[PDB]
Amino acid sequence: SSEMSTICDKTLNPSFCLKFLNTKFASANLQALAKTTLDSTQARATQTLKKLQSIIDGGVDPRSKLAYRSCVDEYESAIGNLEEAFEHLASGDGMGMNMKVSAALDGADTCLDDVKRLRSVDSSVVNNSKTIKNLCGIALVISNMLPRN
Template identity: 45%
Template sequence: MASYLSNNVFVSSLMFFVMTGSLNAQVADIKAICGKAKNQSFCTNYMKSNPKTSGADLKTLANITFGSAQTSASGAFKRIQSLVNTTTDPTMKKAYTSCVGHYKSAISNLNDAKQSLASGDGQGLNIKVSAAMEGPTTCKDEMANFKVDPSAMKNSDDFQNICGIVLVISNMM
């Protein structure tokens, strides 16, 4: 009798975890996510342009957008670093060098946020991605008074918009 009861509890527990896992793997509501994003049209275009987002659950979508944020930050860092190396104007070189430092900080914060994402800690992910967004924002603010290469600021805008999507998703986790 004890063996039967033990098996029954085991099977019931197993079914609970299987059902809980399948509930967590529901397809993410992209319209709801983009409806909460700061730049809704960017979010919608981003989601439509990436075939991996279609049918993805929330955790998968978080990983996809977070990966894009890392790629965007890395691309912006490399682009601005190349401007530091090619510009001859000392004032612009100093401004670009400052931006490189801000992007290093952003990349470091994203690396810290990766742990929160892996553990499913939405609040921690939100805090660390918000911190990552500060560097490029500061860079853009510093560059407002200069005639800068437009590609440097385009990367900053894309980064902010992608991080904005990650923030919305982190609030839903």
């Protein structure tokens, strides 16, 4: 039994992880699976940055505006962190990947905390933030399992 076939038990939302690995017929090669996971995570982050900007540009109230602007800053940083995560993955450096994915996760988590006190919130921002947190959680488990140099 490959690690991939049971890896979801080590995540906060195993349902999400099971959906993700089945939907994408996940590689049993952990290096390959790290890369496809990062791909999905970066695509989601980039989409979310665009959504946040669209919401801000449409004109929200000051409380929402500060929250979504904080989310933009967190996502700009998270996107950079995921870019670095890719760079380290390309060298086979699982630990490097892990540190940078961890930093990205905090960006998504911080966005979720920045929007929590809002009376009414954009569901795609909340849902994408949760999705990115979950995807980072999967990538952390994978990067942990890659061979040490």
